[PDB]
């Protein structure tokens, strides 16, 4: 089981495609699940996601024209109950206490959110929080040096290894973080 976590592409509003090297890495038949935080913001990007994996889950971003996407989603992948939301709903934006408030509501082991365009992966109160950032590296008013990034989760029973891919200059660079459920 491995899960691609990405979002805030903002195509065509702020970007026109994923960077060159990301389109090369992201190709069919390698990834089982995709959890997407939203702001695609169109079918052209959706249908591209639909040919990367069978099971693709998407929540509604603030600029998605599609209403059929739910506000939030909880899905289970192995032992982890995972929570998905775009994060424009979480006020103040990117606030820890508000994000944990939302973890208690869904009752999830991992919370994925993405309104900030800023990658974050960390444990807090024995519970895990992912923000994949913007996979296109899209403009945000509140953060000026946006690094194009996505996340690959490698789930095995009661453990998760999250890998963060980042486009720094021309180079794709990877870091790894590991969370075990109590």
């Amino acid at each position: 089981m491995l899960v691609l976590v990405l979002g805030d592409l903002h195509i065509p509003h702020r970007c026109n495609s994923l960077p060159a090297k990301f389109k090369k890495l992201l190709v069919p038949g390698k990834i089982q699940h995709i959890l997407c935080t939203g702001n695609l913001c169109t079918k052209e990007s959706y249908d591209y996601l639909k040919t990367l994996a069978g099971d693709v889950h998407i929540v509604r971003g603030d600029f998605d024209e599609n209403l059929n996407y739910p506000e939030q989603k909880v899905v289970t992948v192995g032992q982890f109950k995972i929570g998905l939301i775009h994060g424009h709903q979480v006020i103040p934006w990117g606030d820890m206490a508000s994000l944990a408030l939302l973890q208690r509501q869904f009752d999830v082991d991992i919370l994925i959110s993405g309104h900030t365009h800023k990658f974050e992966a960390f444990e807090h109160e024995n519970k895990f929080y992912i923000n994949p950032g913007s996979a296109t590296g899209a403009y945000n008013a509140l953060e000026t040096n946006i690094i194009p990034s996505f996340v690959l989760m490698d789930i095995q029973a009661s453990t998760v290894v999250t890998y963060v891919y980042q486009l720094i200059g021309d180079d794709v660079k990877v870091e790894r973080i590991e969370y075990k459920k109590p």
């Binding site: 491995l2 390698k30 690959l152 890998y163 891919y165 180079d171 660079k173 990877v174 870091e175 790894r176």
Partner: peptide, 12 residues
């Protein structure tokens, strides 16, 4: 510890 930019990654 570094990792390759591949899917999935591998170690150095």
């Amino acid at each position: 510890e570094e990792y390759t930019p591949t899917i999935p990654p591998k170690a150095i």
